[PDB]
Every structure is written in structure tokens, then in C-alpha cells.
Amino acid sequence: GPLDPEVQLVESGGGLVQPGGSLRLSCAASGFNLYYSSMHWVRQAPGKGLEWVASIYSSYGYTYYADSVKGRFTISADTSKNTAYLQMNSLRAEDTAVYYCARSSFSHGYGWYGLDYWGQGTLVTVPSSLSASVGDRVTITCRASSAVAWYQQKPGKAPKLLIYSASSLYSGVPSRFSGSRSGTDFTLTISSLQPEDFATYYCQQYGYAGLITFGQGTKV
Amino acid sequence: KKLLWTYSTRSEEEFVLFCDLPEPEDIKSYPHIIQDKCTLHFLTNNSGSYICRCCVKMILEVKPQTNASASHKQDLLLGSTGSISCPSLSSPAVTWYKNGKLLSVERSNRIVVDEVYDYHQGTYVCDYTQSDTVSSWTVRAVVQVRTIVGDTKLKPDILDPVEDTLEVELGKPLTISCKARFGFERVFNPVIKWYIKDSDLEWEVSVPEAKSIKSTLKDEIIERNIILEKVTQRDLRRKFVCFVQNSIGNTTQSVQLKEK
Ligand SMILES: *[C@@H]1O[C@H](CO)[C@@H](O)[C@H](O)[C@H]1NC(C)=O
């Protein structure tokens, strides 16, 4: 909206590592203050969907992990370099995946408006289907306290934010899209599908405290 | 336990039904009408007079509008205040429901909301009864409300120190505190720092890292203190300047020390 110095996210340190080994990943943040941002490592094992790995909240020094990892990896940040690192010890060979870091806004009341910015991801080696056509209405449901968000991934790039706070439409996202809470079953809509809207779509939840849960994926 | 309502459609509408029978053409969710629990959801010249089970029979008459103003997609800026108009009444006693729960029953065509929080999103139902040549139905319209995030249009406000001068007794320590209020930015990069003004130079004093003393949807308040172990005689010859800045602008406040 204003042409002000804006946000990059560089990832590094990935490589081919033997099982039982260790490897340090790095995320060079650029354009945002780590004391008013939460930084996240979200993972994509080849072919499957997105999975949350680790969060850090530099302001308070809080760090959170998904149980599927909890115990092995240590997430840290150096606010004097605006750099977050994911320290991986004893890779169990399911860790094979591309590792994205992504930002969120963690300031003011500390509500969750999505992962606004992702890096390209760094590769470390150790979704369902809808099918409609250009012009159709498509609705995607998701059943399971948070404010949900919807992302759109294109085959080899990092996810884009479409929706935050379950209804509100992220900047740039065309007005076609819609979001709803409806009890425990949130639902994304594309009003009149266009040729560019074909992608894998993920929903996401936050929390209790800070545990991020993604959806299973939907190929449209 | 029969209830009646009518539903006028216009441009992009929706409709819901509640099990108004005391809770702790359907019964058969065959069409595109969704049920979650205790609440059915209508995505639009039909009818749909259903019942669910102490039974509650609903008798709806959907009827497109002809004569026709706030619409069924209304945005509330969270942090600040806002209001949700009743699309229908563009006043009788309007009863508001937020996602099935009861909000107000006030005689006006707009509910006002003082501090918009995240949970103010949802679908709101504004019911009001209507009698004609004698027949008492209820008018239901559903408005979907979004809690959208929006950056401030405002410079940071310095709340402390507000005075130009500070009286001090030299040889004793002094702490000048700078507090400033920051409004919401999605990529929030606040700048708050202390400066010294000696002969014609300005330089950033070298301590310490700021902290928040308040963080709510509307206000982030950040304080940053300067500490002098003992006010010397020079310390009356310089000025100490609080400087805050955010993406809209910057404000300062200088402090000149006095002796007494
Ligand atoms: C601070 O704001 C003033 C204008 O109000 C501007 O003229 C000055 O150069 C600013 N300093 C910075 C870094 O913006």
C-alpha cells in the first residue's frame, strides 16, 4: 500500500545428511523487527502437504515445536542479525523435506493474521483433489481457539496467503475468495474459478497456546 | 413450537435457522442447505419451512425484493470501534444474533461495537417482527462481518515526558523515561530512542533495549529509559531528546534539566 522497504526471507544450510546426523538451517530475515514478529519453520516432505515445525517469538524468548519433532530440533534467533536458525540433530530420515521460514505479525494484542511472508525454502535430504472448470463455484470445507487462515501453493513455490481471521481477504488476493467459520468446520470459496486459481490449498489453525495446525490439502 | 419468517433476497445473501425450541421439508438435508448443529444454513424464490427435534417448526417464505444502504458484507476494523447495520432496515426492536448467540434487542437498525476484537467476525442475524392485516411474521436477514486488519494513519504519540523541563539536584542519579504509543502496522517496525543535544551535534545514547508496557489491539506502548548515574554540571548544558518513529511519521520531545 505504501512503497516502504519490504520483507524478504532467505533460507540456507540445507544439504544431504546421513541419518543420526545434524544440520543447521538459517533464515535471514529482512524488512521486519524480530521483536514484533513470530518466525516459523514450515516443512514440506516431497509430494505431501505442509507441516508446522517450529515457532519462535523473539520478544518473550518463547519457542514452540510440533510434537513430531519435539526433542530433536532447537529453534533460535539472533536479533542482532535478524536471523533465525533451526538446529537439527539426529535426523530420523522422515525429516527429508523443503523447509520454509515464514513471518507472522506478533505485536499489539498478539492475534494471528497468518504467515504473511515465506522464504523460498531450503531442501534437506536424509493432498486430495477437487477438479472443476473455469467459471464454476467451488467450496472447500475443513472440520476439526484460533483465527483461521488459507494459503495457496503452486507446485514448486512457497505458499501465498489468501485469508486471515477466517473471513478477511489478504492484500492482493482477488475478491472471488471467501472464508467462513461455521462452528468447527471452516470453508474457503472461490466464486468463479479462473485459469490461475488451480493450485493446492491449505487451511490453518493457531493454538490454547501457540500450536499451528495446517490442513491436508486440496487440488483444484 | 411454530415460528414464522420471510427472507427477501437482493444481491449476495444468505439465511440461517435456529432450533428455537428449548435447546440444552426437513428433519433430510437433501438440498444445498447446510446443517452444522441446531442451525441450518441457506444459500438462497423457494421456501423451506422445516422442523427439528419440544419440537420447533419453522415456516419460511423466501420472496425476492423489488423496490431497493449498508449491505450483507460489512467490515469492522479490529482494535477500533464499529457498527453493523441491519441491511433490511435501510426503527422497530431488532434482535441481533452472533453465530446463533443473542447479542442485543435494541430499537435501532444498527448495533455498535466499541472495541472490535478477533471474535467479532461471524455471521450476524438481525430479526424484527412485523404485523400486517393481522399476521405476525419475523424478518430475518444475515450479514457477514469480517475483522479486517488495518495499519494506522498516525504518527507515534509521546506520552512521557510531556514537560519541556525537569528540575534535578546534581550529584544524584536521574532516570528520564520515554513512553510512546504506536498504532497498528502489519509489519510493525517501531523506532524509539534517546538523543543528546550538545553544542550543535546529536548522537544516539548508548542504552538500553526498549520494552513494551502495553500491547492491545489498538495501542502498543513502548518505553525506553535514559539513566545518568550522577547529574553533573554539564548535564544542564545539553538537552535529551526522545525520538519515536513509525511508518507514518516521527515525533520527538526534548527535556532540559534545571537545578534546584
Ligand atoms: C523525522 O520527521 C521529520 C518531519 O516531520 C523529517 O522532516 C525528518 O527528516 C525525519 N527524520 C527521519 C529519519 O524521518
Coil, helix or strand at residue B91: coil
Look-up of cell digits 547529574: B231
How far apart CA B159 and CA B63 sit, in angstroms, is: 56
SS (H, E, C) chain A: CCCCCCCEEEEECCCECCCCCEEEEEEEEECCCHHHEEEEEEEECCCCCEEEEEEEECCCCEEEECCCCCCCCEEEEECCCCEEEEEEECCCCCCCEEEEEEEEECCCCCCCCCEEEECCCEEEECCEECCCCCCCCEEEEEECCCCCEEEEECCCCCCEEEEECCCEECCCCCCCEEEECCCCEEEEEECCCCHHHCCEEEEEEECCCCCEEECCCEEC
Give contacts of B36 with chain A, Cβ < 8 Å.
182-183, 185
The residues that bridge with A186 in the sheet, in sequence order, are A142
The CA B245 to ligand 1 mean position distance, Å, reads 9
Query: Is residue A143 less than 8 Å (CB to CB) from chain B?
Result: no
Positive or negative torsion for Cα A37, A38, A41, A44: negative
Q: Are B62 and B39 in contact (CB under 8 A)?
A: no
> Nearest Cα to A99, choosing from A77, A84, A120, A121?
A121
CA distance B210 to A64: 24
**Residues in contact with B103: Cβ distance below 8 Å, sequence separation at least 6, in sequence order:** B96, B97, B111, B124
List the grid coordinates of B34: 447446510
Residue type for A92, please? Answer: R
Cell numbers at residue A194, please?
Answer: 479462473
Closest-CA distance, B18 to chain A, in angstroms, reads 13
Strand B174-182: give its sheet, edge to edge.
B157-160, B174-182, B220-228, B211-215
Task: Assess contact for B102 and B157: CB atoms under 8 A.
Answer: no
Binary contact (A108, B217; C-beta < 8 A): yes
What cell does B104 get? 442485543
Cell numbers linked to B196: 543528546
Answer for the pair B116, B80: CB distance below 8 angstroms, yes or no: yes
Q: CB of B42 within 8 A of CB of B35? A: no
Nearest residue CA, atom 11 of ligand 1? Answer: B250
Length of chain B: 260
Distance (Å, rounded) from C-alpha A42 to C-alpha B69?
A: 44
Going B156 to B212 to B148 to A64, the CA torsion angle's sign is positive
Task: In whole angstroms, give the CA distance from residue A79 to residue B188.
Answer: 15
Would you give the distance in Å from CA A214 to the centre of its chain?
8
- Cell numbers that stand for B215 in this block: 500491547
Check: CB of residue B154 under 8 Å from CB of residue B185: no
Torsion, CA A35, CA A38, CA A39, CA A45, rounded to 10: 170
Q: Best substitution site from B242, B250, B253, B254 to test ligand 1's pocket, by max atoms within 8 Å of Cβ?
A: B250
Tell me the one-letter amino acid at A175.
S
Cα(B18)–Cα(B101) distance, integer angstroms: 10
CA B159 from centre of chain:
23
Strands (DSSP E) found in B169-235 = 174-182, 191-198, 201-204, 211-215, 220-228
**Cis-peptide into B22, omega within 30 deg:** no
Find the CB nearest B220 among A108, A164, A166.
A108
B250 lines ligand 1 (CB under 6 A): yes
Which residue numbers in chain A precede an interruption (C–N > 2.5 Å)? 126, 144, 207
Report the alpha-carbon distance of residue A39 to residue A48 in Å, rounded. Answer: 22
Q: Which residues contact B100 (CB under 8 A, 6 or more apart)?
A: B16, B18, B38, B39
Give the count of beta carbons closer than 10 Å to the beta carbon of residue B92: 14
Task: Report in angstroms the alpha-carbon separations of A62 from A1, A34, A37, A208, B160.
Answer: 31, 12, 12, 15, 30
Nearest-CA distance from A31 to chain B in Å? 8
Is B37 an 8 Å CB contact of chain A? yes
Rounded alpha-carbon distances, angstroms, from residue A206 to A85, A104, A200, A209: 22, 12, 20, 8
What is the grid cell recorded at A216? 491436508
**Strand partners for B4:** B59
CA distance B222 to B190: 9
For B184, the enclosing helix (H) or strand (E) is none
Of B36, B121, B220, the CB nearest to A165: B121
State the burial class of residue A84 (Cβ atoms within 10 Å of its Cβ: 0-12, 13-18, 19+): buried
d(CA B83, CA B87) in angstroms, rounded, equals 12
For B:203-232, CB contacts with A below 8 A are 212, 215-220
Please, which residues have CB within 8 angstroms of residue B102's CB and are 6 or more apart in sequence?
B95, B96
**Cβ proximity of A84 and A39 under 8 Å:** yes
**Segments of B14-94 assigned E as strands:** 15-18, 34-35, 39-42, 51-52, 56-62, 73-77, 82-85
How far, CA to CA in Å, does B220 sit from each of A21, A82, B118?
Answer: 43, 21, 17
Please report the resolution in angstroms.
3.3
